[PDB]
Design a protein around this ligand. Sequence first.
Ligand SMILES: N[C@@H](Cc1c[nH]c2ccccc12)C(=O)O
Ligand SMILES: [Fe+3]
Length: 307
Amino acid sequence: NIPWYPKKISDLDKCANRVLMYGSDLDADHPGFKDNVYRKRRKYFADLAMNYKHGDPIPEIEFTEEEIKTWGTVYRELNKLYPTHACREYLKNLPLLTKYCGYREDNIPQLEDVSRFLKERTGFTIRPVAGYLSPRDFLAGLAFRVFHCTQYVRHSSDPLYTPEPDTCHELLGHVPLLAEPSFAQFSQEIGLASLGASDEAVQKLATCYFFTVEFGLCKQEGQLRVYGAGLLSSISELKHSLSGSAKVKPFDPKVTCKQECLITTFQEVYFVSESFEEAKEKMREFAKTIKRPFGVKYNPYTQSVQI
Ligand SMILES: N[C@@H](Cc1c[nH]c2ccccc12)C(=O)O
Ligand SMILES: [Fe+3]
């Protein structure tokens, strides 16, 4: 029996913010969970996300001097590593972000400005979210070219790694590729394939998504490079992935889809494709094997999904 799925872009208001939270589904010995004062600050961002309705501007945030300093460290340190660690497709759009989005060490990009930039480039827009979103709902968002983003900044004591996604993850891990027409098209295709598929089928697709677009590696002129958003936002996990001591295995959906997705620690294993194009291709073909009893298109003019 076909699970509920959104049919038009405003339907993303329905049961919004079904997110995984510390003290319910997440735990880790890390100050971003354990520092009570920091959790009280995080609730300011969460409330903003919970009251958002499609059509609203995204709330502009007054960040603390501490939060701005954290963004600065993350931005600066990651940019030193990208030239040697990131795949060329990721490197390509970095200068657009600085030139056309105001990415700077001394200022955190606002989600409203980034959404406007992305809409113009590939038609992607942003919706704010209170934490790690339910995988079904996150993939459903992509079908409308909607990327759900957190707005809080990770705990300042650990710029290197954080156990839930923060705004640095969205802005540095996802935005550069989302700015690329061919990648934005790929993203929506994966999202459309997920709509109304069984819980077991979505779990398998979402796991493969996690180990490719969140934590994926690819070969490039005989070398190992990274394209996964979750690595590209973590100073320490990014280095570790290419350190020579990480466990690395070929991406094979039928094996990979069984791996547990680790939200709050470094991964136990990373999966490699023979190239970045091969990664997208194997993902598209896997999405087609879902066994859904109907097909679906997106109509960008009505912003609705046609069966
Ligand atoms: N570890 C990531 C944030 C993160 C936590 N859990 C995740 C799951 C998927 C992608 C990213 C994440 C970072 O430090 O930037
Ligand atoms: Fe991500």
